[PDB]
């Protein structure tokens, strides 16, 4: 049911795929979207994964209110949604809807932390967040209301905080790679792109090859002690000296879902990795109009039970007045990784035909071997989905030496890996220059740093920065961005 081609009209393909797969429904308020069960199940799955992992690290869940009074929020402004009335009565002070929870949580932290006995404090909350985005909205990727988790920790030393920052970053890599089969690059944000309220910002970056755009998948901040000075979060150490806590913060949103969609979708529609898919195997009985004698649906129900015994999430599409081909296309558009076809011949030979969504390959499998084989296949699918994706990621990055190679590489919708001197003036200059050169070619075009990757390619002695010509410190990943 997907008519737009993915590599040609990418935007139309995306909107079509997310609507026709029954994942999102559009809404009369711009930038907001209904998340239907088909996408919300994926959200629940990654949420359970991340929650278990952070509970293993001693992180505890909380809920702080979504309203913050004006005087507490102010001590970014154009994006804040303000409540001024309840009914027709005006409030004595306008209250903001949560754009993030620093100004709600850190006063509580100031109260709760007095002693070194109170450290480390590790809190997380799953919640919704409202920001009146000026950029044009994209479902999942950039929405005016989005779901996320935000974690905030305070420690007695910077080293423990940095350790937690890196552990959370690894959990985000697993979120994207183990759950969603999306490859991401760990990296350090530049000083012009890092969270201004912190010391050092780490990130995972993903790549959309259709439009050649980089996107920040999740963020992890070594905040340091300036939030503690601002909010007076102090503690007495063992000697009795007052000291500031070292803080970290980290967050990840439903944007991940969108990334996943863009990574694995094809011309037929979605491809949902088996680890997060709401239905892993849909059983489609080959039946036409008004002649269901009970044989085929009976065997389909027995097979559903046998598969569910193996923890496989299974649905039987037994709806009438739909041809089997229609159902095939329906569940292919939805992205079900495995399709089980059971017809009269399969009933006669004790077999079933299983089709992979990602490659289309078919398999004849006897009933007795259904649960093992399918399990095998699912992992295969998952792994294949990652591998191909990573290949595409790596084929979208160009190593360059000079600024002359920037604009061609950008026009091939590629990221650029370049030796960079890392001084802050150079990034502003490079953004302005690439934007001007983008407009003069034109028949949001600015290139900024996406990350300074932890995984550094070799840096030969005497390599100069691709822009200023100063000695080059590290390889930096640049590109157009969301």
Ligand X SMILES: O=C(C[C@H]1NCCC[C@@H]1O)Cn1cnc2ccccc2c1=O
Ligand Y SMILES: Nc1ncnc2c1ncn2[C@@H]1O[C@H](COP(=O)(O)OP(=O)(O)NP(=O)(O)O)[C@@H](O)[C@H]1O
Residues 6+ away with beta carbon under 8 Å from 444:
480
User: Coil, strand, or helix at residue 201?
Assistant: strand
Nearer to a copy of itself, 68 or 215 (CB): 68
Signed CA dihedral, 216, 219, 222, 228: sign only: positive
Site of interaction with ligand X (CB under 6 A): 76, 79-80, 99-100, 102, 131, 150, 195, 219, 221, 249-251
**How many residues sit close enough to ligand Y to count as binding (CB under 6 A)?**
14
Q: Which is nearer to ligand Y, 217 or 397 (CB)?
A: 217
**Alpha helices, H only, 141-192:** 158-174
* 139-147, 152-160, 372-380, 415-423 -> range binding ligand Y (CB under 6 A): 139-147
The residue written with tokens 């009976």 in the block is: 298
Among ligand Y, ligand X, a copy of itself, none, the one that 81 touches (CB under a kind-dependent 5 to 8 A) is: a copy of itself
What is the residue whose two structure tokens read 């990652």?
Answer: 386
- Residue closer to ligand X (CB basis): 219 or 278: 219
The residue at minimum Cβ distance from ligand X is 251
What is the Cα–Cα distance from 158 to 226, expressed in whole angstroms? 12
Torsion of CA 257, 259, 263, 264, to 10 degrees: 10
Phi, psi of 93 (to 5 degrees): -140, 135
Residue 142's binding partner out of ligand X, ligand Y, a copy of itself, none, with CB under 5 to 8 Å set by partner kind: ligand Y
Give min distance, CB of 215 to ligand Y, in A: 7
Provide long-range contacts, Cβ within 8 A and 24+ apart, for 347-352. Answer: 347/295, 347/296, 347/299, 352/303
Residues in the chain: 482
Smallest separation, CB 132 to ligand Y (Å): 10
Within 163-279, strands assigned E span: 185-188, 200-208, 213-224, 234-236, 242-244, 246-253
- Of the pair 117, 242, the CB lying nearest a copy of itself is at 117
3-state class (DSSP) for residue 386: helix
412 interacts with a copy of itself by CB under 8 A = no
Question: What's the gap between Cα 263 and its chain centre?
Answer: 11
190 interacts with ligand Y by CB under 6 A: no
Q: Does 142 bind ligand Y (CB under 6 A)?
A: yes
Size, binding site for a copy of itself by CB under 8 A: 59
Per-residue binding string, a copy of itself, 121-160, x by CB under 8 A, is: --x---xx-x-x------------x-x-------------
Footprint of ligand Y on this chain (CB under 6 A)?
A: 100, 131, 133, 142-143, 146, 148, 216-219, 251, 253, 255
């Amino acid at each position: 049911m997907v008519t737009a081609k993915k590599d040609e009209n990418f935007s139309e393909w995306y909107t079509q795929a997310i609507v026709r797969s029954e994942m999102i429904e559009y809404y009369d308020i711009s930038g907001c979207y209904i998340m239907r069960p088909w996408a919300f199940h994926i959200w629940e799955k990654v949420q359970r994964f991340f929650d278990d992992e952070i509970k293993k690290m001693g992180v505890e869940n909380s809920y702080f209110p979504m309203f913050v009074s004006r005087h507490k929020l102010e001590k970014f402004s154009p994006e804040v949604a303000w409540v001024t009335h309840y009914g027709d009565s005006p409030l004595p002070e306008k209250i903001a809807i949560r754009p993030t929870s620093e100004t709600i949580m850190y006063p509580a932290y100031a109260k709760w932390i007095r002693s070194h006995r109170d450290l480390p404090l590790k809190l997380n909350q799953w919640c919704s967040v409202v920001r009146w985005e000026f950029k044009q909205p994209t479902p999942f990727l950039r929405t005016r209301e989005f779901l996320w988790q935000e974690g905030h920790t305070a420690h007695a030393t910077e080293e423990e905080a940095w350790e937690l920052v890196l552990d959370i970053l690894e959990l985000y890599r697993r979120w994207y790679e183990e759950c969603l089969a999306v490859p991401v690059i760990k990296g350090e944000k530049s000083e012009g792109e890092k969270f201004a309220g912190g010391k050092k910002t780490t990130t995972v970056e993903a790549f959309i090859p259709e439009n050649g755009r980089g996107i920040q998948a999740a963020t992890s901040h070594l905040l340091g002690t300036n939030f503690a000075k601002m909010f007076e979060i102090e503690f007495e150490d063992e000697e009795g000296h007052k000291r500031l806590v070292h803080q970290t913060s980290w967050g990840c949103t439903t944007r991940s879902l969108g990334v996943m969609i863009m990574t694995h979708g094809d011309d037929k529609g979605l491809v949902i990795p088996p680890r997060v898919a709401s239905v892993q195997v849909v059983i489609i009985p080959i039946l036409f109009k008004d002649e269901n004698t009970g044989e085929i649906l009976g065997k389909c129900r027995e097979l559903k039970t046998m598969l569910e015994k193996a923890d496989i999430r299974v649905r039987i599409d037994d709806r009438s007045n739909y041809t089997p081909g229609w159902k095939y296309n329906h569940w292919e558009v939805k992205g079900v990784p495995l399709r089980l076809e059971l017809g009269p011949k399969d009933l006669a030979k004790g077999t079933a035909r299983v089709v992979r969504r990602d490659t289309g390959e078919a398999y004849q499998i006897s009933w007795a071997d259904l649960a093992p084989k399918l399990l095998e296949l699912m992992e295969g699918i998952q792994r294949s989905l990652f591998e191909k994706a990573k290949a595409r990621l790596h084929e979208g990055i160009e190593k360059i030496s000079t600024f002359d190679e920037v604009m061609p590489a950008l026009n091939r919708k590629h990221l650029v890996l370049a030796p960079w001197c890392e001084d802050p003036e150079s990034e502003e200059q490079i953004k302005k220059e690439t934007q001007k050169l983008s407009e003069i070619q034109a028949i949001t075009g600015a290139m900024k740093t996406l990350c300074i990757p932890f995984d550094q390619p070799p840096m030969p002695e005497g390599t100069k920065c691709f822009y200023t010509g100063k000695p080059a410190k590290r390889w930096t990943l640049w590109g157009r961005s969301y």
